[PDB]
Amino acid sequence: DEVAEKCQKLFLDFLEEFQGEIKYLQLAEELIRPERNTLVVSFVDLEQFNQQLSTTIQEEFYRVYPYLCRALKTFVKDRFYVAFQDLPTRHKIRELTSSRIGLLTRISGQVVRTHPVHPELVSGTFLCLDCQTVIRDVEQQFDTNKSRFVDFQKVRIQETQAELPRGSIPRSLEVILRAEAVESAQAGDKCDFTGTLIVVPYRLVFLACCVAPNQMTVKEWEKVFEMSQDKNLYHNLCTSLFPTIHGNDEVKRGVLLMLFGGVPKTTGEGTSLRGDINVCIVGDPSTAKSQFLKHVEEFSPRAVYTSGKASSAAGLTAAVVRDEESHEFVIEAGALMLADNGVCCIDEFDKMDVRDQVAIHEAMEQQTISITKAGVKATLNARTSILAAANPISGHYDRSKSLKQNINLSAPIMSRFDLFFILVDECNEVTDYAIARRIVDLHSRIEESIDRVYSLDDIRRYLLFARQFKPKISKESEDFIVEQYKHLRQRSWRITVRQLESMIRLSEAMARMHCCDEVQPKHVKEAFRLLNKSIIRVETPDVNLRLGFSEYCRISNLIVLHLRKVEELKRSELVNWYLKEIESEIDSEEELINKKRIIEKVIHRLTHYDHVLIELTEDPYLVVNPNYL
Amino acid sequence: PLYMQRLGEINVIGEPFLNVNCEHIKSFDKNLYRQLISYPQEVIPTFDMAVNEIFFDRYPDSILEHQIQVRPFNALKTKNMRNLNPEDIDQLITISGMVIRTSQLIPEMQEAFFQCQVCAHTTRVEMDRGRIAEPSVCGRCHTTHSMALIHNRSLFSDKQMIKLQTVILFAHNDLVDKVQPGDRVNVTGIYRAVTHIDVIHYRKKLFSEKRVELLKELSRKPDIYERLASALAPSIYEHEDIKKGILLQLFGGTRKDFSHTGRGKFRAEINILLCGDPGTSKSQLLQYVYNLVPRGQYTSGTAYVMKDPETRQLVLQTGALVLSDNGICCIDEFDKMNESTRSVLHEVMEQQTLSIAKAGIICQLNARTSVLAAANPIESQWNPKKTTIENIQLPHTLLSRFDLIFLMLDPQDEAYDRRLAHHLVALELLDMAVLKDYIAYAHSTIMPRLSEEASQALIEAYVDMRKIGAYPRQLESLIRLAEAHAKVRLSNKVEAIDVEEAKRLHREALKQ
Amino acid sequence: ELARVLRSVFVSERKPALSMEVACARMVGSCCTIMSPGEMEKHLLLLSELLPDWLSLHRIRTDTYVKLDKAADLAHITARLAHQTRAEE
Numbered sequence A: 001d002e003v004a005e006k007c008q009k010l011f012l013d014f015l016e017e018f019q020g021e022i023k024y025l026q027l028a029e030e031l032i033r034p035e036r037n038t039l040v041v042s043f044v045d046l047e048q049f050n051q052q053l054s055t056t057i058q059e060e061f062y063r064v065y066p067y068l069c070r071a072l073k074t075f076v077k078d079r080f081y082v083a084f085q086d087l088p089t090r091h092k093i094r095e096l097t098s099s100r101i102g103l104l105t106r107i108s109g110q111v112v113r114t115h116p117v118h119p120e121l122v123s124g125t126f127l128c129l130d131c132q133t134v135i136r137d138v139e140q141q142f143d144t145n146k147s148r149f150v151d152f153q154k155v156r157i158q159e160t161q162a163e164l165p166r167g168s169i170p171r172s173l174e175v176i177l178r179a180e181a182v183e184s185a186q187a188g189d190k191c192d193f194t195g196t197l198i199v200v201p202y203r204l205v206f207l208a209c210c211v212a213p214n215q216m217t218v219k220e221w222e223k224v225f226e227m228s229q230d231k232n233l234y235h236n237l238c239t240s241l242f243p244t245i246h247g248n249d250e251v252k253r254g255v256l257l258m259l260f261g262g263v264p265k266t267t268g269e270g271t272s273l274r275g276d277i278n279v280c281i282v283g284d285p286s287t288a289k290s291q292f293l294k295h296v297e298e299f300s301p302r303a304v305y306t307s308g309k310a311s312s313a314a315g316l317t318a319a320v321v322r323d324e325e326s327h328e329f330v331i332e333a334g335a336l337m338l339a340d341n342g343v344c345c346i347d348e349f350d351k352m353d354v355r356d357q358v359a360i361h362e363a364m365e366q367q368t369i370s371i372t373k374a375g376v377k378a379t380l381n382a383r384t385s386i387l388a389a390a391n392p393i394s395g396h397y398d399r400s401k402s403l404k405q406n407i408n409l410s411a412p413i414m415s416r417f418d419l420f421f422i423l424v425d426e427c428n429e430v431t432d433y434a435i436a437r438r439i440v441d442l443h444s445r446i447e448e449s450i451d452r453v454y455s456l457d458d459i460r461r462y463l464l465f466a467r468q469f470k471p472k473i474s475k476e477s478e479d480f481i482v483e484q485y486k487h488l489r490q491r492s493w494r495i496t497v498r499q500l501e502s503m504i505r506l507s508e509a510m511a512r513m514h515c516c517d518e519v520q521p522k523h524v525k526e527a528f529r530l531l532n533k534s535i536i537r538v539e540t541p542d543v544n545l546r547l548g549f550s551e552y553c554r555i556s557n558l559i560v561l562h563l564r565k566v567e568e569l570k571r572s573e574l575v576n577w578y579l580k581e582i583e584s585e586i587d588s589e590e591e592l593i594n595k596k597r598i599i600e601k602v603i604h605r606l607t608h609y610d611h612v613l614i615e616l617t618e619d620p621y622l623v624v625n626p627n628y629l
Numbered sequence B: 001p002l003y004m005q006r007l008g009e010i011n012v013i014g015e016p017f018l019n020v021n022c023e024h025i026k027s028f029d030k031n032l033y034r035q036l037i038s039y040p041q042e043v044i045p046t047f048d049m050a051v052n053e054i055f056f057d058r059y060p061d062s063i064l065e066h067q068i069q070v071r072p073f074n075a076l077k078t079k080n081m082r083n084l085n086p087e088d089i090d091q092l093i094t095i096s097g098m099v100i101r102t103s104q105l106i107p108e109m110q111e112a113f114f115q116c117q118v119c120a121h122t123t124r125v126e127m128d129r130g131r132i133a134e135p136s137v138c139g140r141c142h143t144t145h146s147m148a149l150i151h152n153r154s155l156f157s158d159k160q161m162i163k164l165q166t167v168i169l170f171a172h173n174d175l176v177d178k179v180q181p182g183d184r185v186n187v188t189g190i191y192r193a194v195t196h197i198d199v200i201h202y203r204k205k206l207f208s209e210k211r212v213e214l215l216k217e218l219s220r221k222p223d224i225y226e227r228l229a230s231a232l233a234p235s236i237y238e239h240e241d242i243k244k245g246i247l248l249q250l251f252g253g254t255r256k257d258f259s260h261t262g263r264g265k266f267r268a269e270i271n272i273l274l275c276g277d278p279g280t281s282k283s284q285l286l287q288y289v290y291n292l293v294p295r296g297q298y299t300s301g302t303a304y305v306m307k308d309p310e311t312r313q314l315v316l317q318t319g320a321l322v323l324s325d326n327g328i329c330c331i332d333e334f335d336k337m338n339e340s341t342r343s344v345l346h347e348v349m350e351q352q353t354l355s356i357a358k359a360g361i362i363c364q365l366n367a368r369t370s371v372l373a374a375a376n377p378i379e380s381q382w383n384p385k386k387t388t389i390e391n392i393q394l395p396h397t398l399l400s401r402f403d404l405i406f407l408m409l410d411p412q413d414e415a416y417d418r419r420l421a422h423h424l425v426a427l428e429l430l431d432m433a434v435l436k437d438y439i440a441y442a443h444s445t446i447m448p449r450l451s452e453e454a455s456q457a458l459i460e461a462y463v464d465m466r467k468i469g470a471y472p473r474q475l476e477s478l479i480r481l482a483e484a485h486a487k488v489r490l491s492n493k494v495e496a497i498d499v500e501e502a503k504r505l506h507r508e509a510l511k512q
Numbered sequence C: 001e002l003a004r005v006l007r008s009v010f011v012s013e014r015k016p017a018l019s020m021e022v023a024c025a026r027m028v029g030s031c032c033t034i035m036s037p038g039e040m041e042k043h044l045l046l047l048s049e050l051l052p053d054w055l056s057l058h059r060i061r062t063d064t065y066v067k068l069d070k071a072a073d074l075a076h077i078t079a080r081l082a083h084q085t086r087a088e089e
Ligand SMILES: Nc1ncnc2c1ncn2[C@@H]1O[C@H](COP(=O)(O)OP(=O)(O)OP(O)(O)=S)[C@@H](O)[C@H]1O
Pocket: A244, A245, A246, A247, A248, A283, A284, A285, A286, A287, A288, A289, A290, A291, A292, A391, A435, A438, A439, B350, B397, B472, B473
């Protein structure tokens, strides 16, 4: 092949002239080392150095690869295998056709099975048994001492879930790894393999050479920075993540927190502390539960959805199946281990049998799954966050029975969920009006009735940037957590050390949300409410111009705390303090006059209806009723 | 001549494929059409040569990947799959059918690359008639038996084996993977026996203007709705509301995609539950619906995994529910069914999808079906009680998922028995045959959309309905019913009449 | 960067013209930033309008197909794009 010789000369040219320092000189010198025998070459450097050579290599990779190795050996000997990386085109397994044979392409998939290392003979020195003639350098078409052997590994891969078309069985492909590529891949991992599709006697097999697992653009980086400085980022994210769901914002906050997640810690004793959050949702049929599952599935690319009763114990964690060709026993992956470092959603968790939940037990807490079946002994990682949805024993939450009687869940299962929300459906006219108008507006105005503060891709980028930080816990947060847990545990769902660990994880998640390198007690105060609330209504009723019950309690708490602090005042002075404190939120004169109206009404109402404030004789003195805590 | 414009379009796109309608050939030349039918394998090369010569004469500077190939389609021989005879061997045939399974990519050699073992002299051999013309001497050194075949250097053609519902179909090259199992295709190809069919072309409006005019004339009648209700099941007496509900289910709702909203694809197909004594019009009505509706399914009280005997691989088989996708599935004796199946029904009733996680097999399936179920009360008699569960013992979830629930009670009224007996002893045609095509036209052409007046009406209806107890799912069902009634009038907009009729029917069902 | 990716895709596909759907899907599946198909379509339209000599669009039947000149120097195109961006500033 004359073009092969031309390609060899051009490859020598690239190796000898690419630069102001030649990148590959040090790598070639390191190739002299016996443990190093493959050279990694970037494809972008090849295409920028010259285009005809790049196209020829991309088109006739199998034709010129041994010539590339000859060029590499010649270049090294003047002072071996060739590997390529950074091909800019990604392909799908279903795209693999016979027209692409011999093309240098890279494929993305998930490793499901692995095979041990085997020696492969490339060139064999044969001794004739008739005339004792030594025949050397005999290539193989697919004396051991003087022959050449190369390490081999066989890899079986499976199609990714995202690329899998609905109703299609994920096809499997065999991958051959040699020399340094051997043992570089592990079962259960998702990898991108660079190489060619060869024809085995026919049969389809892909030969691979390499594996795959500050620099962001200025405007994306600046948009992330600017949005990281937003004071209302928490509420804006809560609204944007569920634009079409009315009310029930507590579940929104909880799912956002579990998306953020905490940090895992491994003790010096080798014990690992879970840095994830598990959430359970139990509610009457009316309240939307599956919608949250669908939203978190469509938003997070690493989310897996499954049904309750249709899933067996083997299908969730793993199963032991005898391999047809090997005549041995192997392990087929389950749903939980495929959701590694992701989120797994289970619908109708109640319908599942106890024989399945007992299998779930280990993955829930110990975060790993172990199998000791039929002479197969192994342990597998199950680093997952579980979001479960279920209904009470009866379709209707019967108040004639106690709370414990209404939930048919085992005590450890109840304990191992960090956040546990219970939804009760009530007949309220204003809630009915709001729900009806939202539903009809969505049905008639599909696109124009959506106002998202931030784009979903922007939220994903911010979440990716935020998750890699590991905030530190401060001493003030330390003693605040101590006293808060003291008060909390002193009061069915018993509160054990597991809840304390969940509280620490929630504080860490709040710290990661705000991009703060240290944890502050404000996060602890925020998480304390969410841990306390438990049973939660759809929406709180209005209070007479109307104001929310939570805001009313917030104002009352702030004013009582300030008065009690000052004890160790005057109406106008206290109003002036409040306007000084709320200055960070008001942006217009109309908001100021509205706030003045609200605070005057609240002070008068507390004075004359709730009796928590006592008037003492135009600027009367105000004192706190001594029985408010 | 449309063929010159076709050639120009091919020149613009560069795809060397010609689709030729056999009726044009028959009209132009009957003898040539007969020759094409009798000996397609000999006239197709001549057609290819002629079209290639014409194209090269018109545009000689064409850099074509391959020579232009002619693919005739829609031959007169639309013979049934069961009507094949030994007489039409090596003749063109057109068959419509359902695709069950498609094999993987099978490479077939078309050019053999041989290299000399001494001087590396290379040669190419065309694969002909299933035999390899392996060279025996070298072209340079003339050494005998020095040729080596390289599989990688050789040229491969993709071929696929397809099972059609049975006959075996062989797609080659471009035709491979163009058809997905579960679709109806018109396959045109040459009949050959070893029996098999070699695919040449795949084929995957139906009303004249007079039919559309007649449909419009009927729709302009304000009584068409009640007239069609009278037309449905003539042998069934005094169940006009049930026939109205059946017709509304047949029309169904309109499909909407919520991809921009981030929400899942909402169900837009209506399900109706029937409960009553056995021996009533349940079985007859279910059989009538199953026979009348195309792609209907009848079942009595899912997907499964099959071994491939060839590759030892576990393949999937589709149950009646999956096979009835975009169709109507009817079930008898709903109460007498196992709880395991009814638990599975919740997913198909709600999300229209189905997920399986067993033995490492994880898959999701589309299950766009409408369920018409018949159930028997547990007492086998309408015991005087309050809730339907007290007589039928069904969970709240399944009942809430049903859009319409109807109860068949045999009244203890003498006149009703007289009318029943007279109907039996005494036991229209212009309507159902036209109605099948009319329903097809309504499904294909029109889709209604909601209005502001209907918005206010539905909001008030919901706020009044909850006072009786009500879930938002019944509001969704009311929207679907309004869409169905709008489709009944062939009106592109939902108005007050649709909402009022839907609310009336729902309140009548609740009262009953 | 998107222009470079498009050039590489057309090198890989061995085809003179490609449809909007396949090209946009491949670019999204190969791009470093997650983007919607509509954004990719508007970016392709902007590239066509700014630089018509390199990139041409043809409306056939009910679809628009994309044809590109593979012999153009990428460095010169990058310089021209930088000049256009500076002018737009
Ligand atoms: N706050 C809400 N905002 C908008 N739509 C709602 C709201 N609450 C309920 N809905 C509607 O009610 C439907 C019920 O949602 P689901 O999540 O399926 O209910 P569910 O509680 O999960 O009941 P199951 O478990 O599926 S039987 C939703 O699809 C919405 O159409």
